[PDB]
Structure formats: C-alpha cells, structure tokens
Amino acid sequence: SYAVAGALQAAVYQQLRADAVLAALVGTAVYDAVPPGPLAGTYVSLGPEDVADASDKTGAGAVHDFVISVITDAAGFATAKAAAAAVSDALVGADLVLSRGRLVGLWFLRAKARRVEKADMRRIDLVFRARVEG
C-alpha cells in the first residue's frame, strides 16, 4: 500500500503465533491465506488494512488501520471474545521490528462483533492503528 505495508503484515503475523495465549486458544490457525483442508473453524485472519497517508516534507509515513477478524464456528461467541482478547493483549503497545522503516505506535481502534452468515459464524473485527515511519 505504502512502502512499509510489505513488512507490517509480516511482523504482526510474527508477533501472532508466538503468544502463548491464543496458541492454546486458537492453535496454529492464524493466517492470511487459508490452508485448504477441513477448515478448523476458530481461526483469525489478518489482511485488510488501509492507509491514512501521514507524511512529511522530508520523509513519509503511513497510518495503517489494519483489520484482524476473528471467526468462530462455536454456538456462542464467548469463545471468540477471549481469542480476540488475546489478539488485543498481544498488539496494543507492541513495539515490534519491521523490515522497511519502523512503527512508532500500534494503538487500538473500533472493534465490532457480529454474525456474518446464517448466524452460524461470528466475525469480530479488530481495527488497530499502525503509525509507521518509512
């Protein structure tokens, strides 16, 4: 998107699947591309960001408002909350390492939670603001 967005999704994927919680609560089912197979059904997904172009005369940066959705096949979605709670416990104030530039603050934004389809699957989006500096 902006130049940092190649490295940002890579590093927030690496801070995920390293937290001990959400590894005993989701498992290995944290991905962007879905591994085809049986579709385990309590995964998360980390793809849709958008940029709010916060830049400079000398240099330029980006505000990545990336969405991490939590999808859960369970009957209620109290299961999907603690998995999303372990997302938000892992990412606000992250201070991680990027491959192009660095980020300065990984804050938290709106996080809606609803039934996507036939009321069988439950999507909890989690928008995180990622002010990165190129």
Binding site: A54, S55, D56, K57, T58, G59, G61, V104, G105, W107, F108, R129, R131, E133
Partner: protein
C-alpha cells in the same frame, strides 16, 4: 504553481530542514502608520507608507521527529539566542533572516503522534536571494 514540499524552513548548526514540517507559513506584516490631514481630496485615509516598521513571522508545525537540528531548536530556546533562519519560497528563493524562537510547544496524545508547533518571528534585517 509550486509544490508544497519545496518551500522549507531550516535551522543552522550550514542549514538543514527540521525533520517533521507538515505545515509551514511565512507571514509578513506592517502596521500602516496613519498620516491623515484636514485637506483630503475625498477624505480618503492618508498613509505615509515606508516609515512604518515591518515584520516577518514563521509558523512551522508537524510531527516531532528527533534530528540533530530538532535538538538545535531546544538549544536556541533555553540559551536565548537570535540565530539565522531561512524559509525558501519555491520560485522566489530563500529569505535568510535572523529570527527567534518565540514559542514552541510539543504535544502528544494517547493514540496520536508526538507533534509540535514551532512559531517564530523576525529579530533582525532580512534578505532575498532572487
């Protein structure tokens, strides 16, 4: 027309851009010394013009990025100086006047950047490189 990125204010250490300059504005001023007399053709206000003093003021804001020259603006304010500053109009050229550091302010929120305004005003005679 000109690029907004090309007009830049800059400190001495030899002049370098202050790191974050999202918004900047050179502003000139005059106080219009009034010389009104009894006899006027239509009663129109009469002004001498040239005798009145004249000013310049710089207001440059943006993200607080630490550089060697951003620390200089700390140094100019605490140890009170009037060093040389330089705002370059994209076509017009540089200005190169001694300004001072009248008010600076760093600000940050719980979710935003660290930001600053940097407000300056003229302290001596200016120039123009053409």
């Amino acid at each position: 027309a000109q690029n907004g990125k090309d007009l830049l204010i800059k400190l001495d250490l030899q002049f370098e851009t202050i790191a974050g300059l999202r918004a900047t504005r050179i502003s000139f001023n005059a106080e219009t010394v009034d010389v009104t007399s009894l006899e006027s053709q239509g009663g129109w206000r009469e002004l001498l013009g040239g005798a009145g003093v004249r000013s310049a003021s710089i207001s440059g804001a943006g993200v607080f990025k630490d550089a060697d020259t951003d620390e200089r603006a700390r140094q100019i304010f605490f140890d009170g100086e009037v060093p040389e500053f330089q705002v370059i109009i994209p076509d017009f050229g540089i200005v190169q006047g001694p300004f001072m550091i009248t008010s600076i302010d760093y600000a940050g929120s719980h979710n935003g950047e660290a930001s600053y305004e940097l407000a300056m005003a003229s302290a001596g005679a200016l120039s123009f490189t053409a």
